[model samples]
Target chain A: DALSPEQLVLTLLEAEPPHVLISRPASMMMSLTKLADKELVHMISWAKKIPGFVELSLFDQVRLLESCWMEVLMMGLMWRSIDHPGKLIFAPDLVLDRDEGKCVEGILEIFDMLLATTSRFRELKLQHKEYLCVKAMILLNSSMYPLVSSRKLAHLLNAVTDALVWVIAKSGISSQQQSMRLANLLMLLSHVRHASNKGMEHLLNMKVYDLLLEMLNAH
Target chain B: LDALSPEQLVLTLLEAEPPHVLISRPASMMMSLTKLADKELVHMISWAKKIPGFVELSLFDQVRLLESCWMEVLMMGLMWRSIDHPGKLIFAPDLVLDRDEGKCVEGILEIFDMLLATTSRFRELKLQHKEYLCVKAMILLNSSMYPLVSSRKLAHLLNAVTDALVWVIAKSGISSQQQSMRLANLLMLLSHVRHASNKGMEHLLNMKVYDLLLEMLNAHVL
Candidate 1:
C-alpha cells in the first residue's frame, strides 16, 4: 500500500538528503523519470538538494554548472526564437536578466572549465566512450547558447559532432549500442533549432560527415 | 465527411434527444464542452461500432485512446444506439448494469452514458476537448457519495459509482487491479469529493445524493 497523506507530507518534509528515495545503479536512474506523481515528486525532492559548502567561489559555481545546463540552454533558445515565446521572452523574463551579462558570463565561465574536462575524457575513450560523448554534448550545448551568431553556432556544432565522431571512430559496438540518449537529446535540440528563425538549423545540421573525415585523418 | 456517419447521426439523435438530456441535466451540466470535444465521445462510439476488435486493443492503448479522442465519442455512439433503438445495442452483456452487486463494481457504464450526453453540449459549445468534463464528472460523482450515515446508503451510493467504473473496466477489459487495492483507491477518490475544496462537487450534490453517499461511505470504511 502507498503511504497515507500525513506520512507523505512528513516524509517529504523530514527526509535528509532526499535523493536516496531514488537510490539505484546508474541504469535505474534512466527509468525512474517515468514514475507517477507521488514517485516523481519524491525523486525531484531528492534531486533538488541545496549545495552545502560554506565558501562559494567562481570555480565552484562553474563545476556545478552541469546540473541544469541542458534545460537552461533549451530555455534560452526558446526565449530567443521567433515562435512560441509565450510569457517568457527577452531581457526581463528571467532572473539573470537584471545584469544582462550573467547568462553569457555564467555559460562561458563553465565552458572554459568543461572543455578541458571533455578533452581529457576523450583521451580515455576506448573504456569510457558513452560518458565522454554525453560530457561533450553538454559542453556543446553550453557553448552554442551564449553566442547566437552564426560563427559561434558553427564552433559549438563542431564540438558536438567531434564528440559523436569519437564514439563512431573507436567503436567495437554498433551505432545502436552507442548512446540512444545522445541521439534523443540531439533530436530535441534539432527541433528547437528548427523553430528558431535564427538559422540554428545550419548550426545544428553542421555536417557530422565533415567530423568523420577529420576523425579518420587523425586516426 | 459524412457530416455524421450512419451510427454517428443516429448517435447524434440519441444524444440530442430532449428527454434524455433533461433527465441527465442535474448530473451532466457542470462539465465543459472542451472536455466533450477532446474526449471525442462521438468518435469512440463510431469506432467501437466500426472496428471489430476494439475490445482487442491493448489495455494501454485503450486508456491511451480514451485520453485521445475516442472515448467520449464511443460513449455517445452507445448512447445514441441505446436511446434511438433500445434493443439494437446489447450493452455490458457479460454483466447486469446494477446498483448494489447487480453487476459492474461501479456504474462506470452509466457515467459513460452521462458523459456521452455531456459530449453533445460540449460539441455545441464547440470547445476543444472533454477531459475537463471527465474530471468534472468524476469529481461530482465522488462528492455525491460523502453524506452517508448508514451502511446500506453508503453501500448503495458506492455501488453506483462502482457500477460505472466496472463498466469501463469491463468494456476496456484491459487490466485488473487486486480487488482490495481497487476498492481502497475508489474509496479514497470518493472521499476526495467530500473535502470542501473540491471544485466539481455540484453535479452530485444537486441530485440530493447526500443520504446515499453517507450510507455508502459508512459501509465501505467500516
Candidate 2:
C-alpha cells in the first residue's frame, strides 16, 4: 500500500532537524538556506507518497506544494519547537532565537508570534494523530487556486477535515472535552496561517528567503 | 487638544452602525446592506482623512486600505458587543447567529467557539471603549495586509495610534509588566479577529455569500 497519513506525519516529524553553526551572521544565513532546501525536498518527496497526491497532474501537484510548502514547513518546525518554548529548533543541533533569524525584514516579529503559537500548541497538548490530520488539511488547502478543479480539491479536502475531527473525537475521554480540544486546535490554524503569511511576505521582500521558494518551483 | 476620552471615543465608534445588516430569519438566512449603512465605511474614511496626511494618499491606496481592513474593523465591532453565549454570535441587537444554521464549513461550531473565546478575553481585560477604538485603528492601519502601499505617513499613523494606546495603558496605573501583558493580549485578540475573518470568508464562499459581500463592497466603493 501507499504511505499512510500516519506514516507521512511520522516521516516529517522524524526527519532530521538541520544542524547549523551560527558563528557568523552570513554563515548562519547560508546554513539556514541549506537546511530549508533539504527540508523542502523531504517534504516534497513525502507529499508525493500520499495515497492520491501523486495521481494529480504534475502542474497541480506543484501548485499545491507551492501554495502550501511554507505552511507545511512552519507546521513541522512548530511541532519540533513545542517541547522547547521561545526557540525554534530548525534541526536537532540548530536552535534559533528570534533575533538570530534577523536576515529577513519582519521575520523577528513573525518568529516571535510563531513562538507564541508553539506555546499555545503545547498548552493544548495536541495529539499526534490530530496534528497529522490537520497538517494534511493544511496541505490539501484549495482556498487558493490549484490547477485541479474545485470539485476534486474540495472532495479531497473534505475527507482530510473529517479525519481531523475524527481524530479529535477519539482523543478525548468525554464529548465535551473532545469538542473543546477540537475548537482549540482549529483556532490554532489561524495562528499558523498568520505566521505563514508573514513568512511569505519575508520571502517576497528578501532574496535569501525567495531562494527556497524558487528551488521548489524548479522541481 | 483632543476632545475625546478613550472611553468616549470607543462609545462613539461602537455606536456607529455598519452598512451591513445581519438579521435572523426563520427559514432562510437573509443578509442585506443599506445604502447609507456605508456610514461606517465613510466614517472610517473621515477618520483617516483627519490624520494629517492620510487624505493625500492616492485614491487607489485609500480604497485598498479600506478594502483590506474593513472586515477587521467589522470583526472588532462584533467583539465589542459580543455576549457570553455558547454557539451564538451576537453581532448586533438584531444580529445573532447560532452555529447550527446552515450548510457552512464542517468546523463552523468550533470556529464560533473560538470567536467566543476571543470575546471572553476582551471581557476579562475590561477593555475600555477608547482603548478599543485605538486598537481598532491599529488593526485598520495595519500595512501588513498590502505590502505595496509602503508609506511613512501610514507608519506615522500607526505610531500615533500605538502611542495613544500606550498612554491609555500607562494612565490606567497598571504596572509595566501588566501593561505589556495587556498589550500582548490585545494583539493576540487581533490575531483571533484575523482568524475569524478568514474563516468567515470561507463560510461566505461555501454558502454562496461571497458574491453578495463583493457586491456590497463594490456598491460602497463605487
Candidate 3:
C-alpha cells in the first residue's frame, strides 16, 4: 500500500474536492526540510502525473483539470504577492500571510520546483506536463487579485505571457482551451479583486491588465 | 451554490441547445434518419448534445423536465442511456471519447465519464443518486478486465462526485446560501456507496446489481 502511493492518491482524488485535494497529499513519508517541502513536492508530482494519467476517466480528467487550474491559480497568487511585496503586509507573521520574507521564500521554492520539474519532464518527453505547469503559471497570474503597484507583478505577468506564447506556438492546444484559460484568468482576476473588496484603484497599476486587454483584442 | 430551483433547472434545459449554430450546420443534416424526418428539429438535438455546459448539467434537469414536454423527455432519455447504457449510444462517439472514430464501448465510457463530471458539481444529485452511481459503476467495474481498469473507471465517476462534494463543502464563497444542507444527502450517499461496494458489495452481489433499479426510479421520479 505504501509503495502504491498513487492508489491512495487516486482514492483521495475521487473523494476530495479540488481545493481540498490541492492542500492534502504527501510526497514523502518523512520531511527532510523540517517543513512540508516533501509533502509539497508530492502534491506537485501527483498533479504532474495526473494531467495525462489514463487511469482518470474523462469525467475525472475534467474535474482534475478544473482543480489543477484552481490550485495553480491559488499558488500563483501566493507567488505574485510574495515576488512583489512593495510595502508592508498587514498580517506578516501569521502563516499563509503575504509577508516579504515568507513571500520570497515561497516564490523561490516554487520557482526552483517548477524549473526542475519542467526540465525533468522535458527530458522524459512529458510535454503535456510541461505545458500544464506553464499553463498553471499563466492561469495563476490570471487568477490573481490586483495590486496597485508591485515590481514583481509586472515581471510575473511578462514571464507567464512569454511561457504561454511559447506553449501556444509549440503545442496545438485548441482555440477553445486557449479561450477557456484566458477567460479563467480574467475571471480569477475579477474574483480576487472582488473578494478583497478593493475598488477600481487597483486596476490602473497592473500592466498585466493592459496585456490581458491586448490578448482579448488579439484573440 | 446558486441553489437552482426546479423552475430554473427547467429553463436551462429549454435553453440547452445553441439553436443558431445548429441551424446553421445544414438543412439536410437534420433529417432524422430513423423517421419521416423533421430535418430541422432533429438537427437541433444533434447540435445541443455538443454543448459543454449541457454535458456538465445535473441529472435533476433530466427529471424536472419530465413534467414539461416530449423534448425534455428525450433529453432525459439521452442522458440516462448515455449514462447507464452508454455502450449502446449510437451517435457522436467521437465527442464522447474524444476520438474521431466512434465505438459502442467508447460511447458507454464517455457517457459514464460525463455523468461523473456532471454529478461532480450537482451536489444534490451526487448524494441522491449515490446508489445509482455505484450501481452504474459496478455494472461496468464487474465487467471490467482488471482492478486497475475498474479503478480507472471509478475514478472518472468519482471525479464528478468529488467536484460536487468539494463545491458543496467549499461553497461558492460568493453566495449567502453556501451553507445549505439540502444537498448533504447526495454527498453522504456517494461516500457510503463507494465504501460499501469495495468492502462487501462485490462479494455479496457478484455484480448482478441491486441498486441500479432504485437509482433509475430516483432519477426521474420527481
Candidate 4:
C-alpha cells in the first residue's frame, strides 16, 4: 500500500484553475482572492480523501481545515516553485512576483522562508509517503482549535509521525541520519506556521471584510 | 486616575486575588473564580478602574466590559506563570495543574496543549512585562462582545495600545522579519487565549456559577 509521492502530488494538483489570470492594467484583487479561496477549498476537499481524515469527528474536521489550509496552500506553492525562482506559480502562465504580489505586510519575508523550505524538500527528494505523512502531521495538530477529542487527535498525529519514521528508515540512510531528518522535517512545520501567519497578516491588513462588501455591492 | 505603567498595571491586576472563600470545590473542576470571596471581587472591580479610560465609561459600560473581559485578563496573568513551569500550569500557590490532574471535558486536553504551546512560544520570544500589560489592555478594550457606549472611545484606547506594542517591537533592534514574526506569533497566541476563555465561560455557564458571579459583581463591584 505504498502510495507514490508523485501520485499524491498529482492528485493534489489535478484540480482545474478556478479562472484564467488575465494581465489587465488593473489588478482585479477580488478575482485573485476568490481564486485563492477556491483553490484552498479544493485542496481541503482532496485532503478528506486522505485515509485517516474522514475518521475524525466532523467538528474536528472543520477545525483542522480552518487551521491548516494556509499551511497546505504554502506547501502547494512550494511544489509549484520547482524549476522557478523569484515568483509564485498560481497556475501555468500566471506567475506572480513574490515582492510585487498583492501588498501583504511581510509577504516577501514569508516567501523567502518558503523558498528555503522548498529547496530543502527538493534536496531531500521526499518520498510520496513521506510528503503525505508530513501533510497529515500538519493536519493533526489539535492545538489549533478546541477539539472534541484531543487524545484521539493526538493518537492520529502519533500514527502519522510513526509512518514517516518508518518511511525514513527504508531510505538507505543511517538511523542517526534518519532521526536527524525527522527532526528537521518536524522543525519545518514551525516555519510553515510562521509563513501562514504572514499570509493572515496580509489578509487582515487588506481589510478583507471591506473588500467583500465592495465586491458584493458591485456585483 | 493617572495611567499606570504597563508593568505596574500587570502587577496590580494580577496581585489582587479574590479571597479563597469556597471551602469545597468539585474535584472535577480545574479552576473557577467563584471561590473568590466578596472582598476579592471588590478588589477586582477597583483594579479595573485603574485602567485608563475604564473609569470614564458609563457605569453600566464599565460593568459590561469587566464582565466580558475578566477571563481574558485572568488568562493573560496565568500565561506569565506558564513560562517557568515545565508542563504544569500554575493556577495559584497551591493549585498547579498537570494534564492528567484535570477532569475530562471533551476538549480539555487540547486546551492544555494549546496553552503549553502558547507559553513555550512566549518563553522563547521573551516577551517583556510591559508588552504583556499592553496586550492585556488591548484585550480589555477590544471586547467586541460588549455593547459599548461609544466604540469611538474603545477604538481610541485600542489604537493607543496597538501603537505602544508596535513601538516596543520596533525598539528591540531585531531584524524586520523577526519583529514581524514575533508580533504575529503574539497575536496568534491571543486567538488561543480567546478560545480557552470561551471554553471557561461555557464551563461556568454549565455549572450555573455565571449568575453567582454576576451577583458578586452587583453586590461588590457596583
Candidate 5:
C-alpha cells in the first residue's frame, strides 16, 4: 500500500547532474554558486518527504536541516562527479576537472579533497540506493540536541544504518569483494563528512544564495 | 573539515555509537552491548594486523580475511573472556552480565546460549592464553576465504597458523595422547565458532549494535 522510504527518496530526489564546461575563473565561480543554489532548493523540499522529517516539530525540523545542509549538498556533488575521475560535476552545465578548479582561489584545496574522495567513491561503484540511504544517514547523524530523545535517536540511527546494511548487502558481487567494498565505502563517508566541512568554508569566501546563507547563519 | 587518517576513521565511525551503561533498561542493555561490541572491534582489528602471516597477504585479503571471520573472532573473544566469569559474559571490562540477563533479548538468547555453552567448553578444557591466540589465528586463516579465494598465499597462511597452533597445544605440559586429543578438540570447537559467527551476524543485523561492525560486514557481502 506504501512505497518503501528508500523508494520515496529515489523517486522524489533524483539529482540533476551538472553538465557544463569550464568558464573564466571569476565568472565560473558565480555560475557554480547558482548551481549550488538550485540543489539547496531541491534539498529543502526533499527533506519533508523523508518519512519522519515532517513529523518533527517545526522547530526541530528547521534545526535538523540547518545543521547538515552543507553535507547534503556535498553528497549530491560527489555522487555527480563519481563516474568521471578527477572531476567535480557541479552541474551538468558546470563541470570542473581538478586543473580547471585551481582558478577558483582557496577552493583548490577543497576541490582536490572532494575530487580524491569522488575518485575513491568511483572504485567502489557505489549504487544509487546505497547513495540514498547514506544521505539520510548523514542527515540523521547531524540532528543531536534537538533530537526527539536519546532512545528515539538511537532507534532512528539503528533503523537507517540497518536499512543501509541490508541495501549494501543485497549486491550480487562476490562476498569478500562485496564486504571490502562496504568497509571502504563507510570509511569513505568520513571523507564525505570532512570534505563538506571544507565546502562549508568555500561557501563563505565565495557566497551562498540567500536560503543557503540563512541556514549557514542559523546560529 | 580537517583530514582523517585511516586510524582516525575509527574515531569518526564510532562517534555515533552509544557508550556502555552499568544500570540497564531493556533498550539500555541492548544499546550498551551494541556499543560495547563496537568498542571491542578496535582491539580486534589491532590484534589481527599483528599476527605473523596476516599482514603478508595482499592488503585486499588481509581485510577480506578479517571481515569474513570477524564475528567468529568476536565469539572466540567472548568465549575466551568469559572463561573465568562462568554464567556472565565479559562483553567488556565494564559490561559483564549474567547469561540469564543476556537471554532477555530474544535474538541474543540463541547467541548468548551458544556462547555460554562454548564458554564452558573453554573453561573445562583449561584453555591457555597461548592456545587461545593460536586458535584465533587458525580461525582467521581458515575462514570463508576459500569461498572467494583461490590464492596459494592463503593456503600458506593457513598452514603456517595451523602448524603454530599444534606447537602451542603440544607444548602446553600435556602427555602425547592428551596433546593429540587437545589439538583435535580445539579444532572441533572451530566448526562451532563458524556456526556462531553465521547466526550471530543474523541477530546483530536486527539489533542496535548492528550499525558499526555489521555495516562493513554487510557491505562485504555487498
Candidate 6:
C-alpha cells in the first residue's frame, strides 16, 4: 500500500497556517495570551482529523482530550520556541518571555519548566518525523510512565514480543496484512509505554498525591 | 395506560399451569440443578483429564484451568444434555421441567429461557459430540486466565485446541466454505456461552454442594 501514517500527520501540520514571526507590541500581554487561547480551540477540530482519534469511544475521546490537550499545547509551545532563547513562542502571532510577557502571574515556574524541556529537545535535535511522532504519542498516550526499575526487564518484553508473533496468527486475515498488523499494534503499545515513563517524570516532579505517589512508587 | 407498571401476561400464563402437576419449588429447582451440577462438576474433572493437551499444563496451571471453568464446562454439558429436547432442559431424565414451569428464586426464569435459547441454537447447528469436546476444551483454556509463569505454554495449548476444533469440522462431510462458516458460528456461540457461563455461575451461587465450589464461587466473587 502507498499509505504512510507520518506523511498524513506531516501533511496536516503543513495545512495548519504556516508559522511566521509577528513582532507585536511588547507590553500587550493580552494579545500573546489571548491568541494562545484560540489555538486551544483549534485543537478540538485538529483532533477530529486524526486517523484513530474519533474512532475511540466517546468517553475515551473526552477523557483523552481532557488529559493531554494542555501537554500537547505546551509541546507546540516548546517546538515554536526551540530556535529562540529569550522567549517561548506560542505561535507566529503570539510570543512571550519574562521580559515581554509578565502580566500572567506565576509564569516564572511554568516558563522555567517550558524552557528546560525546550532546551532538552534542542540537544536531542528531533527530526521532523520525530516531532510528528511526539505529537501523535501525545494524543494516544497523553493519557498516562516510568513503570518500575528492575533487573528482570529483558525477559518480560522479550516474552511478550515472542508470544505476540505466536498468537497474532489467530486472525483470519491474509499473511501480508498480518505481518504489518503486529508493527502497528506494537507501536500503539510503545507510545503508551513511552508516555507512561515521561508522565511519571512529570508526576515525580510534582514532588504529587498520596495515592498518586504510591502508585508511581509501586510501579 | 390500563396497566400501571411493566407487565407481561406470558410470564403469568407460564406460571399459571395446573396445580395437579407437582412442579419444583425454587429451592428444589435450585437444589436439583446444582445437585446435578455437583455430580457433573465431579464428572467434569474426569472429562478435563482426557482433553488432549490439558494435562501438559503445570499442575497448578491445570488447577487454575479447572477452577476457572468448571461451571462453564458444566454449562456446556447441560446444553448438550438438554439439546435432545427443544424447550425442556433435561438436567436429569426424571428431573426435567418445561422451561416456563419454574417460578424459581430470583433469576431462574431468565436463566431458564437463555438455557433453552442456547440449546435451540445447539440443535439448529446439530452439534457434534466430538466438536462439542473441542469447544469444551476451549472453555477450559479460555477461563483459567492469568497463568503467571506459563502464559506461552497456555497459549500454545489454546491454539492447538483451536486447530483440533477446526480439524474435526473439516473432517465432516461439509465443504471448505461450510467448514469456515461452521467454525465462525461455533466461535460466535462461544461468545454467547461465556455470558451463559457468567449468568449460570450467579445462579449456582445460591446452592453449591462442594465446599471447594463455594470457595471458588466466592473465589470468583460474583
- Each model's TM-score? 0.20, 0.49, 0.22, 0.49, 0.46, 0.45
Question: Each candidate's fnat, in order?
Answer: 0.00, 0.09, 0.00, 0.02, 0.00, 0.00
Q: Quote the TM-score that chain A achieves in each candidate.
A: 0.24, 0.79, 0.25, 0.74, 0.79, 0.56
Model 3 regions more than 4 Å off: A1-70, A73-219, B1-81, B86-222
Q: Tell me the TM-score of model 6.
A: 0.45
Error of 5 at A22 (Å): 14
What would the per-residue lDDT of candidate 5 be over residues B1-222, giving only the tens digit for each residue? Answer: 121222232233234232332333237777786666666665666566566545566667766677767778777877887888777888766777886886577877767776777787678778877667667766776664232323566655554555555556655778744554455446545645665675677666655443466565454444
Query: What global local distance difference test value does model 6 have?
Result: 0.54
Candidate 1, after superposition: displacement of residue A42 in Å?
26
lDDT of each: 0.29, 0.60, 0.30, 0.58, 0.61, 0.54
Q: Which candidate leads the pack in DockQ?
A: 2
lDDT of 3 at A212: 29
Ranking by lDDT: 5, 2, 4, 6, 3, 1
lDDT (10s digit) by residue, model 1, range A94-183: 222223333333333322222222232233332333333333333333321222233433333343344444444356565333332222
Alpha-carbon deviation at A109 in model 3, angstroms? 25
- Cα displacement (Å) at residue B90, model 6: 1.0
Q: Which of the predicted structures, 4 or 5, would earn the higher DockQ when compared with the native?
A: 4
State the weakest 10-residue window (summed lDDT) of model 6 chain A: A144-153
Task: Flag regions of model 1 displaced more than 4 Å.
Answer: A1-127, A142-150, A175-219, B1-58, B61-222
Order candidates by DockQ, high to low: 2, 4, 6, 1, 3, 5
- How many pairs of residues collide in each model? 44, 5, 11, 1, 13, 5
**lDDT by residue for model 3 (B1-222), tens:** 232222333233345432321212221211221121122234433333332232333444322221112222222233333444323322233223222222233233332333333333233233323333322322222211112213333333323333332333333353322222222222222222222222222222332212332343264344
- Candidate 1, after superposition: displacement of residue B8 in Å? 32
Docking class of 6: incorrect
Model 4: residues with Cα > 4 Å off, grouped in runs: A1-63, A66-219, B1-42, B103-107, B145-149, B219-222
